[PDB]
Amino acid sequence: GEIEFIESSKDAGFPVINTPSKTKLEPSVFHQVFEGNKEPAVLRSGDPRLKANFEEAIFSKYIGNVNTHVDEYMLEAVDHYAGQLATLDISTEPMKLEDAVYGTEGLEALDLTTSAGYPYVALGIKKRDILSKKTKDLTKLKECMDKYGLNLPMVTYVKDELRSIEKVAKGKSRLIEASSLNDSVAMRQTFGNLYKTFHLNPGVVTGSAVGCDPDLFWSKIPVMLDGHLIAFDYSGYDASLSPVWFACLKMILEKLGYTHKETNYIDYLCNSHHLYRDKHYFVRGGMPSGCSGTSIFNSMINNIIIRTLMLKVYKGIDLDQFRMIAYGDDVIASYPWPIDASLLAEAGKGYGLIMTPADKGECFNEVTWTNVTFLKRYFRADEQYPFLVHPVMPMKDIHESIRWTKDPKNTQDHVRSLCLLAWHNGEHEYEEFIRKIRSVPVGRCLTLPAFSTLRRKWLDSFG
RNA sequence: CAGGUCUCUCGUCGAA
RNA sequence: GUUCGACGAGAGA
Ligand SMILES: [Mg+2]
């Protein structure tokens, strides 16, 4: 991913965008009860906490592009993954407009809670001014799409979230790319059935975890990944993708039955157009996180990428024994014979990908069921029923969440949600967590689920 | 007044 | 207590 050109939005016939400068995150009543290393991400150039240039920091992810062609490794990779997806019977027929907007099995309706993007954001128009779930009206929508058309610039916002102290100082905040309502709809029309099929089939045939429920899915993963484990991290995956990977995606979509008309949509992903504050800029390469389908297309590409690197590095290898599950850039995999991830990373580098040891380790170590994570969660066999596996989110990450709030009105819901994450750590850890919550006046006012209840509900989930 | 795509889950409500 | 629907929150990518 690379920024090709920047101009003033005025020059390009676009208004300056009002972009929020202040966090919603405030310290909670629990801020001093627990330890934590994270604060709200820098959102503006005049943050007291900066030790670096902010705008320089947030755009540094566009590391550049490699200019290479779709080589023989990619081709075989695409053919192999296309071979799996053919079993699923993905329809390339457009999704009915009502389903695409207001939801159908395997595909939830648009989010009317979120901004409608350009041009609406500068017209003072909201998604709910245009759509309504109670009524399912398409009238007003078709009119806005005919009026403003397709391929609108995406609007860049800084993501309001917790980040480590280090990333605060270095101004390393994350960016999101708001997709225009029109383009979201158009995307969902064209690729909705693929979206649905993926959401209905998390596992090793889609090669995707999108649509999984970790409480249930974790027990299935070791059965599907029965070989020697493969795992590693990427740095700035999305922004690091060079156009050649998008060429790969277009090719696999074609093998699924898609027409050049439809794979043309990917061109507007790869070669994208953005508004940030008062600037209009064009990016070549990079998945613009926030466009419709970012999760699924990122996962599909991840599936191409890993196969490619395997075939490049181990010439001769049999992919039919290979298994992988991606969520965007997050990946867990297995092969019956050992694989040196550090070599895959070196091949990665040549393709413009930055691959590091899993979970920010500093050497590419053996990946074990003991130390492998996925969706920030460890794997732990139940002591009683060893075929059931606990998704174990680190108490320290749970601690980071509880120390902040965007609205103390939500304290009950917030803490209860964390309890459903925490209990998988064990009765002892849970109770300690419950105690510290009760060690403070607001804590003693909350209704908190008992361990035994959580365990019972979970066990019941498998019946 | 402004802050994406999505998945899962919890909670409140409410219809047969 | 199921299934379904609308709202809010949390987490993950
Ligand atoms: Mg990972």
Bridge partners of A208, per DSSP, are A203, A326
Nucleotide lying nearest to A407, CA to C1' measure:
C9
* Burial track A31-44 (b if 16+ CB lie within 10 A, e otherwise): eebbebebbbbbbe
Closest CA to A446 of A13, A30, A26: A30
Instruction: For strand B, give the nucleotides within 7 A of a protein CB.
Output: 1-11
Return the bridge partners of A332, or none. Answer: A325
Q: In angstroms, how far is the first alpha carbon of chain A from the final one?
A: 46
**Torsions phi, psi of A244, nearest 5?**
-60, -35
Distance between CA atoms of A303 and A74, rounded to whole angstroms? 11
Distance A133 CA to B14 C1' (A): 15
d(CA A302, CA A304): 5
User: Is there contact between A159 and strand C, defined as CB under 7 Å from any strand atom?
Assistant: no
Query: If we measure between CA atoms, which residue out of A112, A114, A117, A90 comes closest to residue A101?
Result: A112
Looking at chain A, the domain(s) classified CATH 3.30.70.270 span 213-242+293-368
Is the bond preceding residue A119 a cis peptide, omega within 30 degrees? yes
By C-alpha to C1' distance, C7 is nearest to: A113
Q: For strand B, is any atom closer than 7 Å to the CB of A427?
A: no
Q: Say if CB A108 and CB A334 are below 8 A apart.
A: no
What topology is assigned to A376-463 in CATH?
Answer: Mitochondrial Import Receptor Subunit Tom20; Chain A (1.20.960)
Q: A100 CA to C3 C1', in Å?
A: 23
- Scan for tokens 């959580």, then name that residue: A454
The SS3 of residue A277 is coil
Residue type, A146: D
Q: How many CA atoms lie within 13 A of A390 on its CB side?
A: 21
In CATH, the number for domain A213-242+293-368 is 3.30.70.270
For this experimental structure, what is the resolution in angstroms?
A: 2.4
Side-chain half-sphere of A313: how many Cα atoms within 13 Å?
A: 21
Helix axes A243-256, A260-270, angle to 10 degrees: 160
Cβ of A112 near strand C (under 7 Å)? The reply is yes
> Half-sphere exposure of residue A217, counting CA atoms within 13 Å on the CB side?
17
Reported for A211-220, long-range contacts at CB under 8 A and 24+ positions apart, including other chains, are A211/A106, A214/A375, A214/A377, A214/A391, A215/A391, A215/A458, A215/A461, A216/A461, A216/A462, A217/A391, A218/A377, A218/A379, A218/A389, A218/A390, A218/A391, A219/A387, A219/A388, A219/A389, A219/A462
CA–CA separation, A424 vs A380, rounded Å?
9
How far does the centroid of ligand 1 lie from the alpha carbon of residue A327, in Å?
Answer: 9
What are the distances in angstroms from CA A23 to CA A252, A297, A441? 41, 30, 26
Q: Where do we find the tokens 């200019």?
A: A67
A234 touches strand C (CB under 7 A): no
> If you measure from the C-alpha of residue A441 to the centroid of ligand 1, how many angstroms do you get, rounded to a whole number?
37
Residue with tokens 């490049």: A312
The reply to whether A147 has its C-beta less than 7 Å from any atom of strand C is: no
CATH 1.20.960.20 residue window(s) in chain A: 376-463
Q: How many residues does chain A have?
A: 463
Centroid of ligand 1 to alpha carbon of A213 (angstroms) = 17
- Give the H/E segment covering residue A254: helix A243-256
Q: How far is the CA of A441 from the C1' of B10 (A)?
A: 23
**Residue A60, CA distances (Å) to A2, A173, A348 in order:** 10, 11, 19
Angle subtended at Cα A270 by Cα A66 and Cα A187, rounded to the nearest 5 degrees:
155
Cα A104 to chain center, whole Å? 22
Comparing CA positions, the residue from A223, A193, A221, A225 lying closest to residue A209 is A221
